[PDB]
Design a protein around this ligand. Structure first.
Ligand code: 2BA
Lengths: 122, 123
């Protein structure tokens, strides 16, 4: 039935991995998010960074790459919703980033995507 | 060391009261972009919380917010040391932590986006 592209939120907060921690937290505070999704010049999703990793490696870390986690679970645009929801609800994932066939960052399914979904079913 | 929660907590936590319907609740949740509502009475005293989850499960046989409230809330007072409440979210897996004044009145919560603030101050 329904795909993720339908309900996903089309404004996932990204930063490039050339940018400093000073700059990364700057965005994170403005945008009200505990992570950043890492993305290259052409917007191919590459990893994520944590607020914690910023805090553990702050003294000897100058940049976003210095602390990047490249093993992100993303899910393609046209995947079935049920699966990604099932992952977040039960398998503990905090949100699931959404890409296109070129692995370009295109959306996020946050817990407030579950609201959207539950709101619609009334 | 000696910094409190009140200093940092974000002072707009999303409440609802126990009369409101599920239709009413999920409305507030969507607007505000939040997976849970905190439950407060006429005089704003913290009582519990409801989820997207429970709203989703009990939809068919549940008209009111009270029908599915979770009365057992971890909460903390305004003047608790930040350090303890922060250490709870981080390594004890609490999703966020509601802060009350000494009359158990919701005055704030401490989100994962309260940590950024902390980490931002430290630089
Ligand atoms: N009664 C209430 N009053 C006030 N707030 C309430 C509340 N009940 C629940 N919440 C908050 O709702 C937020 C929504 O969770 P969600 O997974 O959509 O949203 C999460 C997370 O999925 C999202 N996020 C993280 N990295 C992101 C990125 N790179 N792009 C977009 N979103 C990101 O940022 C949000 C930050 O988590 P946080 O715990 O700060 O914020 C949570 C939680 O603290």
């Amino acid at each position: 039935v329904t795909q993720v592209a339908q309900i996903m939120n089309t404004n996932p907060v990204s930063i490039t991995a050339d940018k400093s921690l000073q700059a990364a937290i700057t965005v994170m505070k403005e945008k009200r998010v505990d992570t950043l999704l890492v993305v290259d010049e052409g917007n191919v999703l590459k990893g994520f960074i944590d607020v914690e990793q910023i805090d553990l490696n702050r003294r000897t870390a100058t940049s976003v790459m210095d602390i990047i986690e490249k093993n992100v679970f993303y899910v393609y645009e046209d995947t079935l919703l049920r699966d990604t929801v099932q992952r977040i609800l039960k398998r503990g994932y905090k949100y699931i980033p959404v890409v296109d066939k070129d692995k370009r960052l295109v959306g996020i399914v946050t817990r407030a995507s579950l609201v959207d979904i539950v709101y619609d079913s009334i």
